[PDB]
């Protein structure tokens, strides 16, 4: 529905939608901007990510509420299951949409480390969200798709980015959550978080005051998880 709107107008309205906390609109505007076919700037990538993180975040929270009610019930009839299935299907649709944008054609055109790692982190995240609700023949393949995207992103970020780079840190944080919550590998999650934190600590001395704030913010999230896991 966005094909008739200018790319720059879509970006401007995505920013307005964020201010209005209209994240479904924000996502539709950024989907339209992606489909114009041009690569995305750093700021534009953030807008895309923020929009869909909010949309799917609301869906995941609702799914967890309903899944919990459904587990307690296991006679109220089919309603809790039916409605959990409806939310689940809508969530899977959003994840498929984001993954489709990455595959057509954001990732293949992303040549710089900053953009390619960003998109591969996204790919890992949205397969992780699919894995959270998966139960059928493809649960293992979904998990391996998340793992593979995260791993490629990790390999690039370790080669091409300093240990304090916020995207590198956020990727490691989320990959560690993947290990702990999805892959049943809590020791791998703990080891990754610790090594990521320690390598960043040792590189903080190179940073400006503003970069220091950006990096230590995410380092605290790694620490919070380690405190919860150990």
């Amino acid at each position: 529905a966005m094909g008739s709107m200018e790319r720059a107008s879509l970006i401007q309205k995505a920013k307005l939608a964020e201010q209005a906390e209209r994240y479904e609109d924000m996502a539709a505007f950024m989907k339209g901007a992606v489909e114009k076919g041009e690569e995305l700037s750093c700021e534009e990538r953030n807008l895309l990510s923020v929009a869909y993180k909010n949309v799917v975040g609301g869906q995941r929270a609702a799914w967890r509420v309903l899944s919990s009610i459904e587990q307690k019930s296991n006679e109220k009839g089919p309603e809790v299951r039916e409605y959990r299935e409806k939310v689940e299907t809508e969530l899977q649709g959003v994840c498929d949409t984001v993954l489709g944008l990455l595959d057509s054609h954001l990732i293949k055109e992303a040549g710089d480390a900053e953009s390619r790692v960003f998109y591969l982190k996204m790919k890992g995240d949205y397969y992780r969200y699919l894995a959270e609700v998966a139960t059928g023949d493809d649960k293992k393949r979904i998990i391996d798709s998340a793992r593979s995207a995260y791993q490629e992103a990790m390999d690039i970020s370790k080669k091409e980015m300093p240990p304090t780079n916020p995207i590198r840190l956020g990727l490691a944080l989320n990959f560690s959550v993947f290990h702990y919550e999805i892959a049943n590998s809590p020791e791998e999650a703990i080891s990754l978080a610790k090594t990521t934190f320690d390598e960043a600590m040792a590189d903080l001395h190179t940073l400006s005051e503003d970069s220091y704030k950006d990096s230590t913010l995410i380092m605290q999230l790694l620490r919070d998880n380690l405190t919860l896991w150990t």
Binding site: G57, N174, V177
Partner: peptide, 9 residues
């Protein structure tokens, strides 16, 4: 266990 919040640009 917290992932990146990532909900504010």
């Amino acid at each position: 266990a917290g992932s990146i919040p990532g909900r504010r640009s």
